[model samples]
Target: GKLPPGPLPDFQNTPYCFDQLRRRFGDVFSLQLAWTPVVVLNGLAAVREALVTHGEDTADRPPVPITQILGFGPRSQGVFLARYGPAWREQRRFSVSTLRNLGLGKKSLEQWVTEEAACLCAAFANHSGRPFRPNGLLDKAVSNVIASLTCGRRFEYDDPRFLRLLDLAQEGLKEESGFLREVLNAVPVLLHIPALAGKVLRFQKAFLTQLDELLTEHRMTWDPAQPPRDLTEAFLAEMEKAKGNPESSFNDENLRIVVADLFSAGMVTTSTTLAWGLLLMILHPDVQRRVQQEIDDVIGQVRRPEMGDQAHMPYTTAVIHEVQRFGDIVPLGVTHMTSRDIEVQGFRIPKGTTLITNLSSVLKDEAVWEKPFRFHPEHFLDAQGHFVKPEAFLPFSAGRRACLGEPLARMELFLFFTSLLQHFSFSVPTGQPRPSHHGVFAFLVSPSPYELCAVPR
Candidate 1:
């Protein structure tokens, strides 16, 4: 049978393109981009059928020629971005457990985030009642969590190397989903030409070479018998335990990308979401007052916030959920590929077809939300104002490929957000142009650069 009904070549405007295609071709449809037939699943049902029910069948990451040329190679390595199979499963399993051993969901990790939030607050407070853009501080604060887990320590805010590291990471995120990559995605044949491959390789090669340098420096000092102090040590210990077991995926290349993947994805998404939170609070001071009110009632001014406080403070939780939904970072979500032939919503999706889950569709599905296009906290709140997340609320996605960092992300968002509001109130500074509500799209939909004065309350 022919592939699912769809449109011809479309580049760049994907989710929006998917929107138009879904309307004409129904919820599940395909569009040809370059040599690949890309099938995008819109709304909750079709996306669920593909990702949830047929999770394994559709779990593979497409070995796109452009991606392979860029850096990933044909075989999988990074735990988060690995191709679906035993190697991916093992890497992911080991990575998840290793993070747990390094204090992922427990008090020790929570303390790390809490103290980091304090440092962020101090940094912001240093602006001393003046307006400042929160992007850098937020990036530093968010990255430190992953840094502590990965490399065993956090850098001071003013550390020259730390700033350079974050700067390079920003360049990757800013440029990753833009034109050159999209051009390759649309015309993958371009990568087959050696001249073109070198051009594409430079961007990824430059970033990853620095990553390997950092990983190698840490690789020199770990002792397996001393108990793993961080993710790198834990992985090194795994390599130690799997001695001469030739099948283990715990090798050098995988370690480098795994740690990179954690920072690249973890830091950007969490910090971008927090930036949106601050922007929204400033735009809607009423909402800010209420969230601050909840913070005062639950966590109070003198003490810091904890996970237990989340259960007690429903309003704050609702606001954070709404911020993620409204912010809609990672709107189209990372592309997934079919490990084998699978039928979703009665459509024959052939093996190796690139799949794009329109998470934005599920997030703002009209039938599901009373106010799909607007910011409404009541969408997450009940008649009694208790927080109630609807089934369609999949900010972290679902199934075998659901976000690995979601547990940690949730912890960071709750603690950092509350701590910021506890220390100061965010509002637009006097005499400046009104900060735009619209977001700038890159790989992630980051808020446009904006400033807010954090006056101590």
Candidate 2:
């Protein structure tokens, strides 16, 4: 029953809150959120030990009430929110394989991103170097990448329906990462209250309805005789193959949940990182100029940058790595749980105990980083100016339950980042103050609305 000392502040603010606690109480500590016991693992060493050394025992997810509601209760079906078990394993395996088959790290998907990059550049070019908010444009372009993967198509930039879905996803992510959800998770009965309950239910219902319609449309167009064209078709093929298997996880409900997971997870984080990257470039023009010079020297301005060019563009690669590090998007990370009783750094954590690996702590650990609080690309670069990734770089996280979209995310970041730098020079509009470096923390650390001039280079 003994738990390791942390404050009872809302867990949404854990990254900032826990940083102080880490210094005061050392690496590992505990706190009670409502009646639930939580073990907070802080810093690189402590987080690594718990998530890596004792990974198997620490791979399960905590039973958050909100997640339960979203996952349609106890049986977590989506790959991201799924509990560690057979169903999760099967779904994750299928997803990884399907993504690979759909051209993750391959030429087909690169072409999709390349085409999207062209669209993005054309959109920026239309502004004619005038200052404009790039957030919505970036969101639409990024969402279309996943749309092509899942639905086998892309939407027009101004499509009302597509824009609505993006808005819903953003709202859902913000609410999911808000403090109110944490309170409701800690005390689920509060969800029964009309005002609070209605809000949550309404959000879920609206998004699910839209998602269901998309899937239904896909189903109506299915042709068994032809090869599966996209994720929806691939999943349908699996469902058809596994039909009548009583224990098969390839059912309609799981399909809906998995697609939703991919759409939300795939679109939000990468877009947010790009937003942050552009802002950082505006704030630090020297770094931006260096990146552009590197891009010019390696890939030149003749054509779009390719993934193969990444190996030669060490400076550009380091800059992207540094953006993720400084952005700290998924700060606390998806909550994990103890699969079995385990001791980490001398503290005994019991089975089923909720665990929070303070990713922000590890990303900003002073002992491991030269200037932990600063936005520095050298953190990922060696003395010889070559790209050198440190073990402490846990932006995608580490261990068994790390981000599944990592490879895709990395590819998107490289291509989009290099392409944008090659075509445009980002700078703050005249008479406008530089956007705040501090992000508004939610499910993701998104930069506040800001405008920039994407001058054609």
Candidate 3:
């Protein structure tokens, strides 16, 4: 146990671990979890120095048994879970290029998001000014946007098969973040235990089976002569071209994994952020009113809010940024590994050492943010009240392995956030206690179940 100084705490509660460790061990420290030695980096300076300054060197991912089994064992691994090597490079390149070709940040994708925003507004309107939970509605709307981009089609909110697929996806994420899964990853011997392993396998099989069915349908309708319609087609066409190349990463297995990766990664994080945004609005009525006023003055009620409107609506933009900063989803970012031996802040980190970035530390670093512990929109606003993004504003992790969907996520947040606020004002239901800001942390930190009234403005 000659790792950096850290108390023996449950690994699942890493956010708390980092807080305690940072106090005792400073910004950079190491903790031995189970049998693995993990080096934790805290604050913006240290995180940036490690992840950005030595981006390539610290880019490798640590091997987790569960991720390896479910992602790349009998199945395939996508760019996200692939090791830092030629294969990962190839897949990551293809993914970024394909997303761009499919209009990730372009007008075509904007149309998809804008239309979805309208649909989201309609879903909220159906509640008819009554207090209702928006989680399921937000989930459906957000999932459809990803489905359209990846599968080339959107599903009606009431579609039974589609809704079931969504539930399976959510359940898979829940299981992925479960305590048993964490223990299994750390102690592979647990896999020999029937009940624990069986439980994990059942959910993994269910989720992958659903993904396979969707891919099967896409393959049936494939036409190489025509341009690729969605990510699935794009990957299929690539596989067709790389047919004879043994070194190519393009293949059926990878295609399935990559498509599933895109859907799951894209949907969950963005939807959770939106959910937090809505909850913050209900909790902070003054901020919500300011944002709505900015939306009305800049875009007007007749027209739906567009990405272009983000420029003129500084307060709304600030509010969205604050929501992300305060929410602190992915508190302990996905684990990374050092590709080779490296040194940081006078300490040596050998090759193969596991790395964890405390994004919560950077987001709430009192040294960087004013009122770091509170939800203040002014953290993103300047003295003049115009929106200004701080270097510390990294809800999405930084460096080479940063979120690939940043552009698309930004567009969705702005359009959907402004669109909903434009159509209706959100507030707490009468006599209901104000919802707590403390969230239930798993793979992502999500707000506790809360309901709000969406009064038609």
Candidate 4:
């Protein structure tokens, strides 16, 4: 258990539990959630050992009863968060290949993100430096990236139906108390009750229905000879190819859920991070100016920022890295479980011990960071001023079940943040103090609502 002794009330602050544990214990420690013992790997080394060295063993997602009901469960159609097995491997491989195929050709995924970023910038420009709430605006901008990738089209930010689906996703993310949900996680039976499960199911239904409609629409217009421009059309083709195989996990239901997953994963996480980035920029104008200078000097206004320019824009890249690190979205990350009995230190960890990695702790571990708690990009750079990859910066959790959308999300963040700063300088509206750094933590750590004027550069 490598368990170090700690005080009680383990999940204090819930979202910041691991951070609290790391602050109390040194690095590796164990705590009981009710009765099940959870071993936490805190800093860079412990995280690497569990996720990288023991990637195969750690790959197993310990069975969570709520996961069986709320996640892929018996249906198990290649959903990214589904169990680690043949079905998952096959479906994930296909999805990755399809995304790559769609992302590399003439109208690449990068281009799609760029186009969506333009729409977002336009929407903000319409604000004309006025203070406006940005949740829906940011959500829509992020969702469009997923829409363009999945459905090969975009929705107006104000579209009622699309907005409803966004709201449902927001509702689910808001249910991040980890209290009710954790109860369901421990005692899976609660999830089976109609009264208890109704809320989640309702949101799932609204979301899946939208995805179903998108899938159906894609099937009607899919052109196989012409590679799919988006995920839905691409998945439609994949389903056709895997139609009759007994081993095939590719099908309509899986298609809908995965699209939902992609949309949920991509839209919410990236949008939330960008929201924090924007808020941070407004709060730290000097840092924002440095980022804008990097963009202006490296890529200029001649063309929009894209993924390729990330290398040349070192400070800008570091700023985005710092934002994700500093923002600490998905603090503990979606939970994982052990597939078999394992021992760490001297603990008899059973087969189903929920393995929760403290991603935030790793990002802010004082041993690994010069100023772990501060908003400094220096953590991502060396004395030579070159881009450096820190072990602590695993924004996308590590190991077998690491976030599948890391590349896409990184690309979107880089493009959107750089492009926005290039076009406009961000600042808090007059007479208002700078926005607070305290994020509203639910499914993700989101910047609380704030107003900023995008003063044109």
Question: Which is the leading candidate under lDDT?
Answer: 2
| Clash number for each model | 0, 1, 0, 2
RMSD of each: 2.0, 1.8, 2.0, 2.5
Which 10 consecutive positions of candidate 1 have the poorest summed lDDT? 67-76
Cα lDDT tens digits, model 2, 1-457, are: 4457567665466577777777888788987777878888888888899889999988787775655455463333767767888888888888899999999989889988989989989999999978898888888888889888888888899888888888888878767766677778888888777677767645655777788988888889988799888988998998899888867788877888888888878789899999999999999999999999999999999987889999999999999999999999888887898889887878788888888888988888888999888899999888999999888899877888988899989999999999999989999999998688898877688888889999897
- List ranges where model 4 is wrong by over 4 Å: 1-12, 67-77, 104-107, 343-348
Residue 264 in model 2: lDDT: 77
lDDT of 4 by residue, 88-150 (tens): 787677667767777733347778778887888898889897888766788898888777777
Clashes in predicted model 2: 1
TM-score of model 3 (CA atoms): 0.96
**Per-model TM values vs. the true structure:** 0.95, 0.96, 0.96, 0.92
Segments in model 2 whose C-alpha atoms lie over 4 Å from true places: 1-3, 7-12, 67-76, 193-196
Which 10 consecutive residues of model 4 have the lowest summed lDDT?
A: 3-12
Q: Name the runs in model 1 displaced over 4 angstroms.
A: 1-3, 9-13, 67-76, 183-189, 192-195
- Which pairs clash (backbone N, Cα, C closer than 3 Å) in model 4? 1-347, 62-337
- Candidate 1, residue 9: lDDT: 50
Candidates 1 and 2 compared by TM-score, better number:
2
For residue 122, model 3's alpha carbon misses the true position, in angstroms, by: 0.9
Error of 2 at 263 (Å): 0.7
